[PDB]
């Protein structure tokens, strides 16, 4: 199965529209960050996703919070099986 993922890249402060990709699932009850990163590696090259620290949008108080993810972490959806991530440019 494949799931829809929207991601926002943030450099100075997200000077750009989000991207939409379809991500192949490794397990049928859940998406892991590694699944997203594998798909980006295929589309954008191995050198892209490692430039960013990844978060997923999650409900918090009266809005949302960007919840920091590791490669091995499970990603929870927001709203209706909707997956929204943010890659924040690593500054080193």
Author numbering: 18 to 109
Q: What does the publication say?
A:
We recently discovered Arabidopsis SOSEKI proteins, which exhibit polar localization throughout development. Polar localization of SOSEKI proteins involves two conserved domains: a central domain required for membrane association that dictates localization to polar edges, and an N-terminal domain required for focused localization at these edges (Yoshida et al., 2019). Furthermore, we use structural and biochemical analysis to establish that this ancient protein family contains a bona fide DIX domain—constituting the closest structural relatives of the Dishevelled DIX domain—and that these domains, like Dishevelled DIX, undergo concentration-dependent head-to-tail polymerization. Concentration-dependent polymerization via a bona fide DIX domain allows these to recruit ANGUSTIFOLIA to polar sites, similar to the polymerization-dependent recruitment of signaling effectors by Dishevelled.
Note that no structure of a wild-type (WT) Dishevelled DIX has been determined as yet, although multiple structures of domains bearing polymerization-blocking point mutations have been solved. We thus used the structure of the human Dishevelled-2 (DVL2) DIX domain (Madrzak et al., 2015), to design a set of point mutations in the AtSOK4 domain that are predicted to attenuate its polymerization (see below). Crystallizing several of these mutations, we succeeded in obtaining diffracting crystals for D85A (equivalent to D78A in AtSOK1), which severely attenuates polymerization. We thus solved the structure of this domain at 1.7 Å resolution, following labeling with selenomethionine to determine phasing. Like DVL2 DIX, the AtSOK4 domain adopts a ubiquitin-like fold, with four β-strands and one α-helix. Strikingly, its α-backbone almost perfectly superimposes on that of DVL2 DIX, with a root-mean-square deviation (RMSD) of 1.74 Å. This was rather unexpected, given the limited primary sequence conservation between the two domains (19/93 residues). Like other DIX domains, AtSOK4 DIX forms a helical filament in the crystal, via head-to-tail interactions of individual monomers. The interface between individual monomers exhibits considerable hydrophobicity, and close hydrophobic interactions (e.g., W83-F81, W83-H34, W83-H36, Y84-F37) are likely to be crucial for the DIX-DIX interaction, although hydrogen bonds (e.g., D85-H36) are also likely to contribute (recall that D85 was mutated for structure determination). Nearly all these residues are fully conserved, or even invariant, among land plant DIX domains, suggesting that they are critical in mediating polymerization. By determining the crystal structure of AtSOK4 DIX, we established that this domain is the closest known relative of the DVL2 DIX domain.
